[PDB]
Amino acid sequence: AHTVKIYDTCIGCTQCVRACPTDVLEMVPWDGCKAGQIASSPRTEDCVGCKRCETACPTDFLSIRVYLGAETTRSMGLAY
């Protein structure tokens, strides 16, 4: 399965969560920024590796990082 890590430069704009096509990320409470929320990736088993979440991230550098790894049925996006 792919690995999705959220770094503490996350400003809680929720844009990575909205861009995820497979519902990997969610917004959880976190007192580390003004928005009061951080991205989380509890469902990286459903991560396909598309990196739409990194594309949506406005921080420099990325507060969300996808590391592509071992490939499963789910991560390779197979309908068969």
Partner 1 sequence: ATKFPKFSQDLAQDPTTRRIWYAIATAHDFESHDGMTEENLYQKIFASHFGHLAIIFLWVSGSLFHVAWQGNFEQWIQDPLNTRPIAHAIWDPQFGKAAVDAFTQAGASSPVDIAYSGVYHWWYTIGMRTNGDLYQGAIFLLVLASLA
Partner 2 sequence: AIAVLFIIAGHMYRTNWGIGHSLKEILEAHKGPFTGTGHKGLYEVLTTSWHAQLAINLAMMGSLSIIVAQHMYAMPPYPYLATDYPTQLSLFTHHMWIGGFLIVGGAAHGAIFFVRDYDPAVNQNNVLDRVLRHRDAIISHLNWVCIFLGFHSFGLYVHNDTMRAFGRPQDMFSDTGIQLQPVFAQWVQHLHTLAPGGTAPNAAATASVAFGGDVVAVGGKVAMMPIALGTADFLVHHIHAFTIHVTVLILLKGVLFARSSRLIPDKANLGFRFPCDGPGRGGTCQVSGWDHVFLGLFWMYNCISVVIFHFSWKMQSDVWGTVAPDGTVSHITGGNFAQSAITINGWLRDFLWAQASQVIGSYGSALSAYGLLFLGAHFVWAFSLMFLFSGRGYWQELIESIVWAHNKLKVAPAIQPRALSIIQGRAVGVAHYLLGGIATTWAFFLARIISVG
Partner 3 sequence: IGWVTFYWHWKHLGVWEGNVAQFNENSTYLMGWLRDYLWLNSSQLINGYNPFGTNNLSVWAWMFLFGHLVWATGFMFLISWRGYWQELIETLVWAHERTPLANLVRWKDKPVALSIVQARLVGLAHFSVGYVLTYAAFLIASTASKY
Which spans of this chain sit near partner 3 (rule: CB under 8 A)? 73, 76, 78-80
Token pair for 44:
């990286």
Among 5, 18, 21, 69, binds partner 2 (CB under 8 A): 21
Least distance (Å) between residue 71 CB and partner 1: 5
Per CB under 8 A, 76 contacts partner 1: yes
Complex with partner 2: residue 2 or 27, whichever CB lies closer? 2
**Annotation-wise, does 16 bind a ligand?**
yes
Residue with tokens 């049925």: 73
**Annotation-wise, does 33 bind a ligand?**
no
Token pair for 13:
């704009």
Q: How far apart are CA 49 and CA 66, in angstroms?
A: 7
- Find the DSSP H helices in 9-71: 15-19, 52-56
